[PDB]
Amino acid sequence: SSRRKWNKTGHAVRAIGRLSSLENVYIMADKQKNGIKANFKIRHNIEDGGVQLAYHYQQNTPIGDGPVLLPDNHYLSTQSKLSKDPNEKRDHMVLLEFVTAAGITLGMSKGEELFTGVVPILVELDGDVNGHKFSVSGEGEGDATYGKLTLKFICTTGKLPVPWPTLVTTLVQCFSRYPDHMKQHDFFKSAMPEGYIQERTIFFKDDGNYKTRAEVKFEGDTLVNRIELKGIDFKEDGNILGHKLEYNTLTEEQIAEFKEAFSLFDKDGDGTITTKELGTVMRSLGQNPTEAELQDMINEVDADGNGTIDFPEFLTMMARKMKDTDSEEEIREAFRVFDKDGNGYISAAELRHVMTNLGEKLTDEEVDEMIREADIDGDGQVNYEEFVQMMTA
Amino acid sequence: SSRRKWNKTGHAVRAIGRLSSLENVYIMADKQKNGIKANFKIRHNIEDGGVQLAYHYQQNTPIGDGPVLLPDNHYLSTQSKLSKDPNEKRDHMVLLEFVTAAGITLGMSKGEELFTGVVPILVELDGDVNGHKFSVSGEGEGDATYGKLTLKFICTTGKLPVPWPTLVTTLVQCFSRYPDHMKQHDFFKSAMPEGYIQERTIFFKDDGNYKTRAEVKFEGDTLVNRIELKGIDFKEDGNILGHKLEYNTLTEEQIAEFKEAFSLFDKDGDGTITTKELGTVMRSLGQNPTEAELQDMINEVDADGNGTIDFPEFLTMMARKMKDTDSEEEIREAFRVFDKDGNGYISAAELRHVMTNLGEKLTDEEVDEMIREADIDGDGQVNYEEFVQMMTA
Ligand SMILES: [Ca+2]
Ligand SMILES: [Ca+2]
Ligand SMILES: [Ca+2]
Ligand SMILES: [Ca+2]
Ligand SMILES: [Ca+2]
Ligand SMILES: [Ca+2]
Ligand SMILES: [Ca+2]
Ligand SMILES: [Ca+2]
DSSP states (O other): OHHHHHHHHHHHHHHHHHHTOOOOEEEEEEGGGTEEEEEEEEEEEBTTSOEEEEEEEEEEEESSSSOOOOOOSEEEEEEEEEEOOTTOOSSEEEEEEEEEEEOSOSOOOOGGGGGSSOEEEEEEEEEEETTEEEEEEEEEEEEGGGTEEEEEEEETTSSOSSOGGGGTTTOOGGGSBOOGGGGGGOHHHHTTTTOEEEEEEEEETTSOEEEEEEEEEEETTEEEEEEEEEEESOOTTSTTTTTOBOOOOOOHHHHHHHHHHHHHHOTTOSSEEOHHHHHHHHHHTTOOOOHHHHHHHHHHHOTTOSSSEEHHHHHHHHHOOOOHHHHHHHHHHHHHHHOTTOSSEEOHHHHHHHHHHHTOOOOHHHHHHHHHHHOTTOSSSEEHHHHHHHHHO | OHHHHHHHHHHHHHHHHHHTOOOOEEEEEEGGGTEEEEEEEEEEEBTTSOEEEEEEEEEEEESSSSOOOOOOSEEEEEEEEEEOOTTOOSSEEEEEEEEEEEOSOSOOOOGGGGGSSOEEEEEEEEEEETTEEEEEEEEEEEEGGGTEEEEEEEETTSSOSSOGGGGTTTOOGGGSBOOGGGGGGOHHHHTTTTOEEEEEEEEETTSOEEEEEEEEEEETTEEEEEEEEEEESOOTTSTTTTTOBOOOOOOHHHHHHHHHHHHHHOTTOSSEEOHHHHHHHHHHTTOOOOHHHHHHHHHHHOTTOSSSEEHHHHHHHHHOOOOHHHHHHHHHHHHHHHOTTOSSEEOHHHHHHHHHHHTOOOOHHHHHHHHHHHOTTOSSSEEHHHHHHHHHO
16 A cells, blocks of 8 residues: 555646646736736757756737737647758758637637738847857748748758757747637737737746847738847756757648648638538538537537637547547448448549538549549449548558 | 548548537426436447447436426536456446536536435346346445446346446436536436436437336435336347447546545545645645636636536546656656655655645654655665656556
């Protein structure tokens, strides 16, 4: 029973750790400066084990003179993916991010209209850390409907004197997705096109700090983020100047596939799936759930409780990994949806029917090429074994 | 791009399947009968692949004449674990379940008082399926504070003529946990001690049906469920009479360890952790978060949005499996909490301090035995490597 004592005590201590390790961006109004303030912590993994904490303090204020939206307390949730470009010989970072706003319970600007489509982005940074001067240039696109950013950054001075992950937060929160009931709390878009000034201090525990000032604004059709950074008090042999942090190089391909699938449900392209939209899709495939049943389905996956499914919630649902036998049954059920006449073979006619009903457009010849790619035995249709290979390999 | 077409289309079809496979018990009032009705579906795994659906329809009405609570629409969420007793030679089933009520947004009987502690349970069933007569007897305990049931059932007529999993739903929803804001919607406890009648029809797709009637009531200190079951139209070679269903024999031990840990937080024993309680625990270990920070922590794991953490939410948080490197860092952080003076060794004095502050009672000699079990090199303290072995092996 000594072991029972160790276990029970260890569980309680670990519970406290799981509860307190949140990396969300917590935002409040700053009415005195006609803007907002924020605070949060980032946990950077150290190579070969450990974490380097980075404590962030933030303030934003408008550049122009027009009225802006000042929010109730809330937070932003972010997922980032870092990678490398096989063809690029300069020191660089490729970045993909999804961000959503939450923390205000369902009971509920001109700049918002500037973000309804895909917007080009330019980022320019001049830095000086412990006297080491450097510059960074980036370009890409933002798609606020999905809370999505995609950019590539290059060090334009040679070798970057600090780790790329430490610069991610410095290198456009106007691209966050604010849900319908939170539109009156989106300070960032409300300040456009004239823009805002964003300032931070970032404290690296047991090491130095960065101080940053940036201007974020439209220049023509392009959203531009221009930044100055100064770092002081860094240790030559610490995790930053010593380059001891992990560069975390699920896949981009898969996420893009899931985005395309999401769009088949999201008929009006506003970035969320309503009961009306889900029902339209289900009826097109021959299932006719009631309004209450549709709402029961949505409720299960509705993380922020606003009653509709956004892309990150859809992504979470589809990313959940299954027991190999549960995944097997899921594929059998999918096969039955395609095989409309139940004869054990999916015909070209059946495949076209399912695709066009979902809302996809393609020619008969394109449908035939799909059957060809899957049709191992050459009989002109797709049997169950062929379907499994197509879906899982 | 044929493969891209297959993938995107398959994702949409699988999404529809994940959304529509809910097994929750959906409850509504039945005002005409002074009771409730419910409907739900159960998915039974078939050996070697597939699922056997069982469509459930349910009605409950009070036995006695006193006033009862008639609920707004809501649902019950259930997790079940089935197992065998190595010592038992009779045909049998061991069962562990946790059930909670939800589906009513935070904006908000005498029988309730009968369930504040641990209550003994007796279950008796007489059945007849396609003319095959059988009986079942079970005994165990219910602990509604945690929504917990534990029982063992025996077939008292010999070999059971149907699979054990098909009888689980028939074989005491008064043991469900209703959260504070939902107490006025708990019909089941409000009907006690006189009790209620529970009737169901259960339709097994492509096969026969069960019809059941049960009386659920107190006899002395014991909650008793006495049932008659009649099954008709079953196929001799189907999944039921053919015994082709899986018996799903995470661990009971681990769950009990986690329950003990939960109790260290839940100071007043009401089955939920408030910000006051979490703060009390954190302060006892030397951390002093503000009220707003405590609420931010709770919000992340607060599935039903009522603002506090119940045992199944705590269990979900602690069951989430980590990347091996993330789990490694979690254990390093736990070690630092124990090692108060930071010298790299946990002393008996330090271990006692952490345990007694959490609220555990034990003697100095019992603390020494814990150190002994972990102290591989015999120096009287626990170093990091010894701690890792104790926590992970
Ligand atoms: Ca939509
Ligand atoms: Ca939502
Ligand atoms: Ca067919
Ligand atoms: Ca074929
Ligand atoms: Ca409590
Ligand atoms: Ca809760
Ligand atoms: Ca020590
Ligand atoms: Ca030792």
